[PDB]
Structure 1
């Protein structure tokens, strides 16, 4: 009955880009499932901070470029779970088509798993050079200033991670909108195992 999931969340941009975390996501982040929250920055306001604090007993936050009066937030953070070191930062200009730049940040923090909050607000993950890279997207679906494909809009998302030993299971939660305004939570699972 122990909480066992790590919430990875970021790029909320409340209130300047978005007003709220979607109610369908708040339902999923109810008390007692999440053991730790990694927040990758850009909250930005106090109400949003207080809400994230309420999700879990262990909130670890890094500073985003829009968290302007946030001197008490570190620019990077590293948590250890099982045999894995998990580092994170806002890293808003990091991109997966330049994976060596992400790798250099992972080697700098010296971690197995690197989470970053790329400014494109697209969820993605990939494995590279025996490491795992995770961008949770924007949990509010905040607009991006990056280049979107023609019919593309930002998809609200966050991730939950289950770490056991050298293995990490990642669940991504996306609020996908249909052509008719309807929407639904869509879940996908990804697995990473650190090579021996």
Structure 2
């Protein structure tokens, strides 16, 4: 049921740390599956994703030199087919129609991309487009003030619940989005 949607950890030549509050929340809550959009801070980040959940899925990010990571993956959870990728490849970058075209080629009910460094939950034509933001608040040319953020999905059968965690002004804030079928 519980799925961790995370990504965009590292930007080259820039340092950004995962908020300690996020790591404490994520290890105890028990995570069934992890979907990571990429751009990891090396092996240290992968060790963090591997301990919090048993099933980890990582896609190839633009700054990812890790060998063996596929650029696009498809995961089936409940009655939802989910495809994850970095999202720097969709052009013109975060475009609603560009992302919608990608969702068709994957034939997925949920499409998870992460390149804009801005968390966003959105529904288009019965499809769900998720973006967990940057969990380290990493620098991006697209957002002037990015905040650290992740997503935890509660997916049972065909019911989809999304918990949006962000860190604003040193204070965590979380928003719940409820979707059915």
* Same-fold call, TM cutoff 0.5: yes
Bigger radius of gyration: 1
Deviation at 1:14, TM superposition (A): 6.6
After superposition, the CA RMSD in angstroms is 1.6
Hey, what does 1:190 align to over in structure 2? Answer: 177
In the alignment, which of 151, 162, 170 is matched to residue 154 of structure 2? 162
Which stretches in structure 1 are left out of the alignment for 5+ residues?
178-182
Q: Which residue is equivalent to 1:57? A: 54
Paired residues of 2:9 and 2:16 also in contact (CA < 8 A): no
Bigger relative contact order, structure 1 or 2 (CA pairs below 8 A, ≥6 apart):
2
Tell me if the contact between 1:114 and 1:132 (Cα under 8 Å) persists in the aligned partners.
yes
After TM superposition, which residue ranges in structure 1, 4 or more long, deviate above 3 angstroms?
93-96
TM-score w.r.t. length of structure 2 = 0.92
Post-superposition Cα deviations, 1:48-88, rounded to whole Å, max 9, x if no partner, equal: 111111111111110101112x2311111111111110111
Q: 1:26 aligns with which of 7, 23, 42?
A: 23
Q: Which residue of 116, 121, 124 corresponds with 2:117?
A: 121
Unaligned stretches of 5+ in structure 2?
none
d(CA) in 1 for partners of 2:101 and 2:52?
Answer: 32
In 2, are the aligned partners of 1:79 and 1:87 still within 8 Å (CA)?
A: yes
**Structure 1 length as normaliser, TM-score?**
0.85
How far 1:129 moved relative to its partner?
A: 1.6
